[PDB]
A paper describes a structure:
Herein, we report the identification of a distinct FPMO, [name], that stereoselectively catalyzes the 3S-spirooxindole formation in the 21R-citrinadin A biosynthesis. To gain insights into the mechanism of the stereoselective spirocyclization catalyzed by [name], the X-ray crystal structures of [name]–FAD and [name]–FAD-3 complexes were solved by molecular replacement, and refined to 2.1 and 1.9 Å resolution, respectively. [name] comprises two domains, a three-layer ββα sandwich domain for FAD binding, and an internal substrate-binding domain featuring eight antiparallel β-sheets.
Similar to the “mobile flavin” in para-hydroxybenzoate hydroxylase study, the “out” conformation could enable flavin reduction and substrate releasing, while the “in” conformation places flavin adjacent to the substrate and performs oxidation reactions. The [name]–FAD complex features an open substrate loading channel, allowing the substrate to access the active site, whereas this substrate loading channel closed after substrate binding in the [name]–FAD-3 structure. The FAD in its “out” and “in” conformations displays drastic changes in its interactions with surrounding residues. Superimposing the [name]–FAD complex onto the [name]–FAD-3 revealed that the residues R122, R200, H229, L238, M253, and T333 move closer to 3 upon substrate binding. In addition, the polar residues D60 and Y249 move away from the substrate, which may provide a hydrophobic environment for substrate binding.
Residue numbers in the entry: 19 to 106, 116 to 386, 408 to 431
Amino acid sequence: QQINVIIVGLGIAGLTAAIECHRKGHKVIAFEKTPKMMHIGDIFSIGPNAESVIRQWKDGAISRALNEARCAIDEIKVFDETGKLQNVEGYVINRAEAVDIFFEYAQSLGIDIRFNSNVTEYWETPHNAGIIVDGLKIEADCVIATDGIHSKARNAICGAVVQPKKTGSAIYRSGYAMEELRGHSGAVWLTEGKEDVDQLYHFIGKDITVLVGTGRRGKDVYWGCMHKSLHDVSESWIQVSDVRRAIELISDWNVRDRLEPIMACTPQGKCFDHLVMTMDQLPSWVSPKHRMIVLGDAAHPFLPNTGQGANQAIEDGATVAICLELAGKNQVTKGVQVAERLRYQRVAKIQELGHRMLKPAWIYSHDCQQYAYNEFQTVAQLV
Ligand SMILES: Cc1cc2nc3c(=O)[nH]c(=O)nc-3n(C[C@H](O)[C@H](O)[C@H](O)COP(=O)(O)OP(=O)(O)OC[C@H]3O[C@@H](n4cnc5c(N)ncnc54)[C@H](O)[C@@H]3O)c2cc1C
């Protein structure tokens, strides 16, 4: 009577879905395309709406680990291309630390996890669903696809007409260990900062902004350069460029003497080159026979100014687990549809807020788990 779940894509969404489905008594098999945990990523934020899910894991020990691994920022100093301008309930953390924490916990639960598994084929019958991996068919009661913004699962389940759309902005970024910076005289302004506390710096130019911060109490450095680029050809999170590209962008900046060493000391002189993307609302996240669902960035990428990508990935994973538990093995199709309907409007409202900012308590104060328990039978009846 145990529900068998396949999860594709072990980012934040897939790892939360794996942990939560396992906690709800389902049998999880999870698949990740990379050959090992890659430890790649930018700082993102985790808010209280996600923290309510996380703190229930292992009596708060995962929350504690995330808190220890955060960027312990006191203030944000905002400068312009020459000089100072401004000084200013979620916490900032490097994505690589968060997914590593999530993964080590997930694997410690005994969950069947398989790397080196690039999934493109999805299938379903009235009674089962599954995928093809390494030429072989893997079957289960349902499939949760959390393979990210460049989702191949979305192609299979929803179609390939709706695609992530460029915004016109692109980002160069990297992160590395502080020891790579210490000793460079052009960086003492950042490396000799108050200890036990992380700093965040915004440098605001004409259609160019540079972010520079530290994480884990000065153990890590990160930097990013957002600029307008209509013809950037980046198609993935691991597209690289020479750090020269970002230094060129600020070449006439007065603060260049401060910023150039941060970019130049990036290991191997390579940064990531990313588009800032949006995507239309999908008509449905759910397969024709209601046994497969896309969640996370695969379903609802958010503009980075919302800071909700990781949060809503976590809310997605917690919700679908409850929906499967409440529906049961015999009504898996109902649970999948209920999970979609529970989440569809909320994520859409967040996406629209991002566009409105591009030119609130209703997000942070929401408890997705209690919501799903409260609303399931109502929404099941509508389905
Ligand atoms: C390497 C990487 C770097 C990122 N860098 C940034 C960044 O700098 N800034 C930012 O705002 N967001 C970044 N993100 C996205 C960010 O994690 C998300 O916005 C959000 O926090 C979590 O979304 P998600 O879990 O749904 O998807 P993701 O975190 O993107 O995870 C999706 C996972 O699915 C895997 N996958 C993809 N295709 C397949 C396939 N065919 N078969 C199997 N597995 C597959 C990927 O390897 C990945 O582990 C990055 C994601 C990744 C994977």
